[PDB]
């Protein structure tokens, strides 16, 4: 019916605003990135600080895991991405080519490829083994806010402050579809649904939308939260009830019934904008993270 997410752990350690949290595919770890130029790794179930991963010259906006949970990629204002070995903490590769801040990144399912999005308005596809850039997509006419592969990696979805969502064929780099929502507020976040059929997109008019990709139709709208300023991550929660999860500029974590669009729970505790949320792959566990006047991560757990 409704979840009952309760605070389990508050994770302190970052010296500046947190930018992104992501659970490892094996569910064992939480990774966090931050304006403090650091990646930190935490136990997903006990909240225990594990290690700090350092090397970027400026703040980090996004981090992402490889399928086997062995690698991380981060996106930095220093114009690079870095591929990291999680167990050692060593930088395996530095991905150079973007001409402005790198803002978002993701591995494909196979994890032989990384996709990046930058303020340079481009989307780049990188070879994980070599670190060389395979393709540069002239994707948008403003900063790229998010990039995400579908469930088999055959497609890429991107979003930009230009007001557009675009779907790209990974193999060729050609554009398959542009989603033009009549009236084009900046699109601050986008990702595929777990089944690859839909796309969840956030726009900077306090609105989340679920689109049918094949048909190009908006099926669901989620409102009631605050989002006009920051690129806040949104999630599909699939482990218990089927929810949509997002942070909010009113310091709250919002949870909606995916189907009914009704707010089912609001998570109170953070003392600044909740910029990032992640949903655990197997357990009813949420991780949330907040900006400059908070700087902490919170782990929450529900019965459904």
């Amino acid at each position: 019916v409704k979840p009952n997410y309760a605070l389990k752990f508050t994770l302190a350690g970052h010296t500046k605003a947190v930018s992104s949290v992501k659970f490892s595919p094996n569910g064992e770890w939480l990774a966090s990135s931050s304006a403090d130029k650091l990646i930190k790794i935490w136990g997903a179930y006990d909240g225990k600080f594990e290690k700090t991963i350092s090397g970027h010259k400026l703040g980090i906006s996004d981090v992402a895991w490889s399928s086997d949970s062995n690698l991380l990629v981060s996106a930095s204002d220093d114009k690079t991405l870095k591929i990291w070995d999680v167990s050692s903490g060593k930088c395996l590769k530095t991905l150079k080519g973007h001409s402005n801040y790198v803002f978002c990144c993701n591995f494909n399912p196979q994890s032989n490829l990384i996709v990046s999005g930058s303020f340079d308005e481009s989307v780049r596809i990188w070879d994980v083994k070599t670190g060389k850039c395979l393709k540069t997509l002239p994707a948008h006419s403003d900063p790229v806010s998010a990039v995400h592969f579908n469930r088999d990696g055959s497609l890429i979805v991107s979003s930009s402050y230009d007001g557009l969502c675009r779907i790209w064929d990974t193999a060729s780099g050609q554009c398959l579809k542009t989603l033009i929502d009549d009236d084009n507020p900046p699109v601050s976040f986008v990702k595929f649904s777990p089944n690859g059929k839909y796309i969840l997109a956030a726009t900077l008019d306090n609105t989340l939308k679920l689109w049918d990709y094949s048909k190009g139709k908006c099926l669901k709208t989620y409102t009631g939260h605050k989002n006009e300023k920051y690129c806040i991550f949104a999630n599909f929660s699939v482990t218990g009830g089927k929810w949509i999860v997002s942070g909010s500029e009113d310091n709250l974590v919002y949870i909606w019934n995916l189907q009914t669009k009704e707010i089912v729970q609001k998570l109170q505790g953070h003392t600044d904008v909740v910029i990032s949320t992640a949903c655990h792959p197997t357990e009813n566990i949420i991780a949330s993270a907040a900006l400059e006047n908070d700087k902490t991560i919170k782990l929450w757990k529900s019965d459904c």
């Binding site: 500046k16 930018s19 920051y230 690129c231």
Partner: peptide, 6 residues
């Protein structure tokens, strides 16, 4: 970075 409005 993402942590600052732009």
């Amino acid at each position: 970075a993402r942590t600052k409005q732009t």
